[PDB]
Ligand binder design. Structure first.
Ligand SMILES: *[C@@H]1O[C@H](CO)[C@@H](O)[C@H](O)[C@H]1NC(C)=O
Ligand SMILES: *[C@@H]1O[C@H](CO)[C@@H](O)[C@H](O)[C@H]1NC(C)=O
Ligand SMILES: *[C@@H]1O[C@H](CO)[C@@H](O)[C@H](O)[C@H]1NC(C)=O
Ligand SMILES: *[C@@H]1O[C@H](CO)[C@@H](O)[C@H](O)[C@H]1NC(C)=O
Ligand SMILES: *[C@@H]1O[C@H](CO)[C@@H](O)[C@H](O)[C@H]1NC(C)=O
Ligand SMILES: *[C@@H]1O[C@H](CO)[C@@H](O)[C@H](O)[C@H]1NC(C)=O
Ligand SMILES: *[C@@H]1O[C@H](CO)[C@@H](O)[C@H](O)[C@H]1NC(C)=O
Lengths: 201, 596
């Protein structure tokens, strides 16, 4: 039939501000038409690594719901957004399951997210008692206890503040420049699948 | 829970907070250096004060984690680096006095202006007013006047200041569980905790003497040849049996002998290897110079420069309106930001300097994966040595023919290699006895072997015994002749040049053996050899994570600094000097035979 009602990929990719890696935004996308070839044929993306499905057949398959997780990380931390990886981002900020079906899209955003004085609006968790479970969000700002002594809310000896900031400056190296990451998570559940690609005539 | 995990979390917050504060301090220093303006000075001072205060607070907090309950070598190395008190162990009044003394010595050396009595209407500063006179004059009394007047003014100003300086630095060092300030400087080469690769502070002096004992025949022959040539230049002043007069060495202090190449050239009739005119004919920009250096580093297998390097470096003088420091400096600002500040001219010296500073940048880039407090050289010698090896390789006629800067039909005979080796000896071999004598004198001053009333009587005695250089007229204890040099007056270690010189040729032999060069060592070029670059990069990637002995094992296969690669480098010149010294007398007499 005639196809309209496209999925809101403009409000995810072309968003004016992105969330931090710790309080990463999750947008549930349902009941629309998702054109993935517009994303795949763009030259603006440095990473388009798809795990569990290939980009060519994305435009044919149909999914129940699409989870669009958006955040900003460093250049050297893009590799940790993958199944089975380790690092500060996977252990304490954003963890992907091993059985993950979806795509990880990352692009350099030194133009927008870096200022000459230093942009300290973007934060990451550097400390937590245990590793995160897949698709878990921790936004707690409770003082990390590294020692036997109780912190009591004061950042003294052995008690650190968990969230640290990335001082994104334009003159940084490519491995320290800000990268906007959108992770699309595709699941098929027993409910009627409604996020389908465009159908040919 | 455990102490080690607590230290690891502490050194996980420290690395992140310090990288940010460092980057900010370094960027402020960069903005001052490329733009000398008063607000940039204020911003630099504010960033430096924040950085120093942060280092003081983290040093105060790092000591609360005891060292003996930590078994991981890297964590113990970072905690050992952080837990040094520095001047903080000293009282606030004495620390303020020491800081004031250091600042006033810096101002006295930097703003020291000396000119001739009875003609005081204009005066000349050290750079470039006195440097050009020392490097280019052929007049005995003019050089004598400049040398004696500058040591009179600078020494008479700095002698009480240095007497206070030695006592305060000894007090700080003994407060820091060191024998003296010399032991504090020698603690940079101290390796503790590694089985077999341990190195002691007391072993450094013994190794330096053992290497210098092998340096001594080559230096004696070079000294005899330079003495004969200077006797030709100045007929009556220089004695055949005595030491060289101090003010005739081509520099202000005797640090380098490279300004005597014109007087002491073996074969003047033969041409030089100057490629300046060839770059002028082909219109080589400074950008082309750095691209050729980058081509050399990608040829050996090292990574190429980042885009931010090309965007953010200043490789040309900005202009009259904007002032900048002209000294070439490689900056590792942090967070993958690497820059070179050089006012590059179209000369061979600037081209070799570009290779040297890009070698510094490659060394900085290699240990970027390491933690922040381990991002340095394994010792102070390696960081300069890895730039000097690039300076060695780039200067070879094979490299110049390979890049097209030299004519392909240039005849490489033995005479040009002899005079090139003599120039390299005047630059490299000549600095070794001066460096060793200066560091041994400073170590004896800090140790208390020499009383304050006998500092100069011993010093000239050392200079005659080691350097073979005699004073023009005797100096009493009102003079402070050592502190006229930049490094000693401004609290810098000086053994880094000696260690750099030995490590340079050790690295050169290791990479040339890796690259399968089949000729003389000075004719060796390490371009196009991936295996030599891999052998270099294995050590380069470690940084300060591993002991310098283990890094030296990684490159040359030896656990200690060695002198044989240097002697192998200068072996054609050594045979030529032995042939040329048949009539003349090798060695010197410590008596007052030339002049006193
Ligand atoms: C996002 O911005 C780019 C740049 O103009 C534009 O071409 C693209 O269509 C926009 N939308 C998406 C979904 O990428
Ligand atoms: C240098 O400082 C002056 C001071 O006003 C400023 O106008 C100029 O833009 C600066 N130049 C650079 C390259 O930073
Ligand atoms: C020392 O700590 C580092 C991380 O700080 C770790 O990667 C390394 O494996 C540790 N070494 C040993 C021998 O435990
Ligand atoms: C540093 O100084 C403090 C007090 O002045 C002292 O307790 C500590 O042991 C010192 N650290 C070292 C490594 O000497
Ligand atoms: C460095 O080399 C890589 C691969 O050889 C190349 O893609 C990159 O553009 C080079 N960098 C620069 C600044 O030319
Ligand atoms: C250079 O080589 C030629 C030819 O072998 C020889 O006659 C001459 O003596 C050599 N000169 C030196 C300084 O070795
Ligand atoms: C090194 O490689 C470059 C790249 O082809 C080549 O032009 C150059 O001649 C090589 N150097 C030597 C000494 O062969």
């Amino acid at each position: 039939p005639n196809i309209t009602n496209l999925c809101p990929f403009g409000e995810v990719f072309n968003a004016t501000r992105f969330a931090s890696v710790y309080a990463w935004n999750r947008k549930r996308i349902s009941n629309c038409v998702a054109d993935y070839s517009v994303l795949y044929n763009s030259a603006s993306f440095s990473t388009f690594k798809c795990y569990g499905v290939s980009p060519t057949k994305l435009n044919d398959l149909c999914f129940t719901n699409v989870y669009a997780d958006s955040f900003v990380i460093r250049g050297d931390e893009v590799r940790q957004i993958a199944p089975g990886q380790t690092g500060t981002i996977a252990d304490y900020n954003y963890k992907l399951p091993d059985d993950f079906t979806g795509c990880v899209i990352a692009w350099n955003s030194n133009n927008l997210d870096s200022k000459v004085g230093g942009n300290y609006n973007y934060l990451y968790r550097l400390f937590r008692k245990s590793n995160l479970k897949p698709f878990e969000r921790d936004i707690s700002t409770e003082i990390y206890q590294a020692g036997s002594t109780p912190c009591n809310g004061v950042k003294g000896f052995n008690c650190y503040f968990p969230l640290q900031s990335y001082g994104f400056q334009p003159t940084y190296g490519v491995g320290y420049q800000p990268y906007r990451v959108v992770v699309l998570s595709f699941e098929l559940l027993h409910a009627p699948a409604t996020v389908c690609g465009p159908k040919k005539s | 829970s455990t102490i080690e995990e607590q230290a690891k979390t502490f050194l996980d917050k420290f690395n992140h907070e310090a990288e940010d504060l460092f980057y900010q301090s370094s960027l402020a220093s960069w903005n001052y250096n490329t733009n000398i303006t008063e607000e940039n000075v204020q911003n630099m001072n504010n960033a430096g004060d924040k950085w120093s205060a942060f280092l003081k607070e983290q040093s105060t907090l790092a000591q609360m984690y005891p060292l003996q309950e930590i078994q991981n070598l890297t964590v113990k190395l970072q905690l050992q680096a952080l837990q040094q008190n520095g001047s903080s162990v000293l009282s606030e009044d004495k620390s303020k006095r020491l800081n004031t003394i250091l600042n006033t010595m810096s101002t006295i050396y930097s703003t020291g202006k000396v000119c001739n009595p009875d003609n005081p209407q204009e005066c000349l500063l050290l750079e470039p007013g006195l440097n050009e006179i020392m490097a280019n004059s052929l007049d005995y009394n003019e050089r004598l006047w400049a040398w004696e007047s500058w040591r009179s003014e600078v020494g008479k100003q700095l002698r009480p200041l240095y007497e206070e300086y030695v006592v305060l630095k000894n007090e700080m060092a003994r407060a820091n569980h060191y024998e003296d300030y010399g032991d504090y400087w020698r603690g940079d080469y101290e390796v503790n905790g590694v089985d077999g690769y341990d190195y002691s502070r007391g072993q450094l002096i013994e190794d330096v003497e053992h290497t210098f004992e092998e340096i001594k025949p080559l230096y004696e022959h070079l000294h005899a040849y330079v003495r004969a040539k200077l006797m030709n230049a100045y007929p009556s002043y220089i004695s055949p049996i005595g030491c060289l007069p101090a003010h005739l060495l081509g520099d202000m202090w005797g640090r380098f002998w490279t300004n005597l190449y014109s007087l002491t050239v073996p074969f003047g009739q033969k041409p030089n290897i100057d490629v300046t005119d060839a770059m002028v004919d082909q219109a080589w920009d400074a950008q082309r110079i750095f691209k050729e250096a980058e081509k050399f580093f990608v040829s050996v297998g090292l990574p190429n420069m980042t885009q931010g390097f090309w965007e953010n470096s200043m490789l040309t003088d900005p202009g009259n309106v904007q002032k900048a420091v002209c000294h070439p400096t490689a900056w590792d600002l942090g967070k993958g930001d690497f820059r070179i500040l050089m006012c590059t001219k179209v000369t061979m010296d600037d081209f070799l300097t570009a290779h040297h500073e890009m070698g510094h940048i490659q060394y900085d880039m290699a240990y970027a994966a390491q933690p922040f407090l381990l991002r340095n050289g394994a010792n102070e010698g390696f960081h300069e040595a890895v730039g000097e090896i690039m300076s060695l390789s780039a200067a070879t006629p094979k490299h110049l023919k390979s890049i097209g800067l030299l004519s392909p039909d240039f005849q490489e005979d033995n005479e040009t290699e002899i005079n090139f080796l003599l120039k390299q000896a005047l630059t490299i071999v000549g600095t070794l006895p001066f460096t060793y004598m200066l560091e041994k004198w400073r170590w004896m001053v800090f140790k208390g072997e020499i009383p304050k009333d006998q500092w100069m009587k011993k010093w000239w005695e050392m200079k005659r015994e080691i350097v073979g250089v005699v004073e023009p007229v005797p100096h009493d204890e009102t003079y402070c002749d050592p502190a006229s040099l930049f490094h000693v007056s401004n609290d810098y270690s000086f053994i880094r040049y000696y260690t750099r010189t030995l490590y340079q040729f050790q690295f050169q032999e290791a990479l040339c053996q890796a690259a399968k060069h089949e000729g003389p060592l000075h004719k060796c070029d390490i371009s196009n050899s991936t295996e030599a670059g891999q052998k270099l990069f294995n050590m380069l990637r470690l940084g300060k994570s591993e002991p310098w002995t283990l890094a030296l094992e990684n490159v040359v296969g030896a656990k200690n600094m060695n002198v044989r690669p240097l002697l192998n480098y200068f072996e054609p010149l050594f045979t030529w000097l032995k042939d040329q010294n048949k009539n003349s007398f090798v060695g010197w007499s410590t008596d007052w035979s030339p002049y006193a």
